[PDB]
Design brief:
The structure is a homodimer.
Chain A (H helix, E strand, L loop, with lengths): L1 H8 L9 H11 L5 E4 L5 E5 L5 E7 L4 E7 L5 E6 L11 E3 L5 E6 L19 E4 L5 H7 L5 E4 L4 E3 L2 E4 L2 H16 L5 E7 L11 E9 L14 E3 L6 H16 L5 E3 L9 E8 L7 E3 L1 H15 L2
Parallel strand pairs in A: 3-12, 3-13, 13-16, 14-15
Antiparallel strand pairs in A: 1-2, 2-12, 4-5, 4-9, 6-7, 6-9, 7-8, 10-11, 11-17, 14-16
Pfam families (chain B): Peptidase_M42
Family (chain B): Belongs to the peptidase M42 family.
GO molecular function (chain B): aminopeptidase activity; cellulase activity; metal ion binding
Chain lengths: 306, 310
């Protein structure tokens, strides 16, 4: 499942250019599905099994990044955030583009006091990125305007933890993939991979969102290795609540460690939301515990079949 | 070429289920190819010749269809479209599936009132498909949920013109295949048949050409300046941001077309990693069970490519 964690977390998938991610999900799932289709707006719909119950397992394809807005005289890039990324996780951080070009990030500091003052009020109009080109003529071909970029950091295992970029949400995509690769369906199971936008082709009876939640384990609560984070919604149908209680009895039934969050898009069909605790969200080094993710897989395997 | 266009347009190939169209294409080009391959996504790629210049041609193997999203109790199938299918081109039509199955679409509402209204502001929420199924189980065994079907209408000739379902882009497939069958390749030819998805095909190529369908506005009550028309020749499209290389390929195709009296017709519109040009065959009633092309546009097209590449 860890080959999978790399192949997905390392897959280049910013908004609108996620084709590789969909690929690895497909060739990864090839041999364990009945069908799929890419919907008008870019979401991918997988279905497996013959069942009266139709369940949707949603997971966000996309990962945070930056977009170019201005190419410079000497060939430097102006950028702006896509997804919830802070200009602080980018200082000294190197960036990939879809063609493969690597760029480096720096600050528009002039003096020695400006480099200590641009930060306490740092926006993206004070950053820049080097590609290696010295001209705008040599820089526009390397990267047009509207080019996206992502973290260059890859997947590393730190003493049993899985640290990589974009554990949000391809720990969830990876979990769904693994479920399809190990489950024998007792239901008609769709797995939908979503394009979030402006910050359902199939009709089902129950939707289940696989997302991540920030871990409060940071010094000074959702904890690693404590289980999947089950989200209770302050306002939901009797049917969403029954989804929740069903997953609860099944978790208490098979001695499955699990957590429960309450934090202050829903299909109209009854939906629930389960998250994996992930530290350092919106950083190149988001940390998950694999026992949590195989615990989540095990739970879904149990509730949705054998 | 009537036999080829027949096989291609009548082949069943909806969003991934193209083993029939691929098998027909390889079946067709056998004895003329120097190799082929199916990538991890299903794209069929062939190559012939070993010239210095590398030229690629590409045309989509896919056709519009329907996907079944639900099966009710009586055996009727609720559908959502695959591709750009008008709900109207379906009403009264029969639907063709892979395992030997045929269905018939129907509209909800029994009274004259709700039918007459539902046809106004129609959609697939208000449709279904009967298989002759009386049980939901035998429907699930005949047509599982997630099953794709294409138009059941087939190929026929009308006073010299060719009509069939899925001319886009099986007619481009026919152009490529005939080109490969009647070629003495001077360049290194790669043929690419597009699956599913609208930045390379794993083939480095000097230049690339697309064989596409274009809407012919020669129909009545259509009055556009510089309209596409049947038997006007292959339509050579002009792009807005066309690079020097794309304009070079395009200009070369114009040169051949006029040098050998090959009829052709430009097409004016309302990044670019490879030199590319876009040629199109004019076609009538795209997205209908009965798309129509003129054969001499296809012959002039294959002549254009064969003389530009051999």
């Amino acid at each position: 499942m860890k080959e999978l964690i790399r192949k997905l977390t390392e897959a280049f998938g910013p908004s609108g250019r996620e084709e590789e991610v969909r690929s690895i999900i497909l060739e990864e799932l090839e041999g364990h599905i009945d069908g799929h289709r890419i919907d008008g707006l870019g979401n991918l719909i997988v279905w497996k099994g013959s069942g009266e119950k139709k369940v949707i397992l949603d997971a966000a394809i996309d990962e945070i990044g930056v977009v170019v807005t201005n190419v410079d005289d000497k060939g430097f890039l102006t950028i702006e955030p896509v997804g919830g990324v802070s200009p602080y996780m980018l200082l000294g951080k190197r960036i990939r583009f879809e063609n493969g070009t690597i760029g480096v990030v720096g600050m528009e500091g002039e003096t020695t006091e400006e480099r200590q003052e641009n930060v306490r009020k740092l926006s993206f109009d004070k950053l820049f990125i080097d590609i290696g080109a010295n001209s705008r003529e040599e820089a526009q071909k390397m990267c047009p305007i509207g080019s996206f970029g992502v973290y260059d950091s890859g997947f590393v295992e730190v003493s049993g933890k899985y640290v990589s970029k974009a554990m949000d949400d391809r720990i969830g995509c990876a979990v769904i993939v693994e479920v399809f690769k190990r489950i024998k369906p007792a239901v008609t199971l769709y797995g939908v991979f979503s394009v979030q936008e402006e910050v359902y082709g199939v009709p089902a009876d129950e939707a289940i969102a696989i997302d991540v939640t920030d871990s409060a384990d940071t010094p000074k609560a959702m904890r690693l290795s404590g289980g999947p984070a089950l989200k209770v919604k302050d306002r939901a149908s009797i049917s969403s609540k029954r989804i929740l209680e069903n997953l609860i009895e099944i978790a208490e039934k098979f001695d499955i460690k699990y957590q429960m969050e309450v934090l202050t898009t829903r299909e109209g069909i009854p939906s629930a939301t389960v998250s994996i605790p992930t530290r350092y969200v919106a950083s190149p080094s988001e940390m998950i515990a694999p026992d949590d993710v195989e615990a989540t897989v095990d739970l879904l395997i149990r509730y949705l079949g054998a």
